[PDB]
């Protein structure tokens, strides 16, 4: 009721890369156009989390760090789910006027990374995710990256993410702890794919200026102020399994 | 800080 009535009130709708369908493929082009694609997701994940049941009740300053820590992991859950929703997986739906094919995949030299993400997708199938288990585990994503430091209060962070686990075994409700057991596997899953990701697009930034590849204003601080700290190990996602 | 980031969060 209540708690999966806000989630999917919430939900963002569609949102467009901008991509020039009609040039041919080639690398700076693509990696540019999905560079502007994260900025517009990225604009929606803060309208989205600042709607999510709890979430102002965090710090500011946490606030602020769990979505630039989750980021890269939200963008590739909900890609994966609109993959699997719009093409059965067949390609890596990024956007409706940026779908990516194997030939894509490669050009982008982002294919062993595709692969994963591809799987991914194929994965929401294979388990039968439903609408609603998506919507939960996608909330409780949002709240799985954190400082070793501890976050400017954690007490109140570790209060938010229990009840987003509570949530989730109430839409699971032996057969109810073999459900929690692959959803947590797979949530799982998200955080090895999102590192490969932020080392990706962290090397890209690096070199951006000589591979022609542009960086939005608030992408480029992310990924060169709080992705090394993830890429350094200061700040590591909550697994639920070892 | 973000400043880009933090406005859309206060806004
Ligand atoms: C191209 C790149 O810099 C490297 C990996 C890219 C990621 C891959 C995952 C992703 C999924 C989406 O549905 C939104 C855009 C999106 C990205 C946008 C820009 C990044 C961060």
Excluded at chain 1, 69 to 92: E, K, P, Q
Aim: include cysteine.
């Amino acid at each position: 009721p209540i708690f999966l009535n806000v989630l999917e009130a919430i939900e963002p709708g569609v949102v467009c890369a901008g991509h020039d369908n009609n040039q041919p493929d080639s690398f700076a082009a693509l990696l540019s156009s999905l560079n502007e694609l994260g900025e517009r997701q990225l604009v929606h994940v803060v309208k989205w989390a600042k709607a999510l049941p709890g979430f102002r009740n965090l710090h500011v300053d946490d606030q602020m760090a769990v979505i630039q820590y989750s980021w890269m992991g939200l963008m590739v859950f909900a890609m994966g789910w609109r993959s699997f929703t719009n093409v059965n997986s067949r390609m890596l739906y990024f956007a409706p006027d940026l779908v990516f094919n194997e030939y894509r995949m490669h050009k982008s030299r982002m294919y062993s990374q595709c692969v994963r993400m591809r799987h991914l997708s194929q994965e929401f199938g294979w388990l039968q995710i439903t609408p609603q288990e998506f919507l939960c585990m996608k909330a409780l994503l949002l709240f799985s990256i954190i400082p070793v430091d501890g976050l400017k209060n954690q007490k109140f962070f570790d209060e938010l993410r229990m009840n987003y686990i509570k949530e989730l075994d109430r839409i699971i409700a032996t057969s109810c702890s073999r459900r929690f057991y692959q959803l947590t596997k797979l949530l799982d899953s998200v955080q090895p794919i999102a590192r490969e990701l932020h080392q990706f697009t962290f090397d890209l930034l690096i070199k951006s200026h000589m591979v022609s590849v542009d960086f939005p204003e608030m992408m480029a601080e992310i990924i060169s102020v709080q992705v090394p700290k993830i890429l350094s190990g200061k700040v590591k996602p909550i697994y639920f399994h070892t | 800080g973000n400043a880009a980031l933090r406005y859309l969060l206060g806004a």
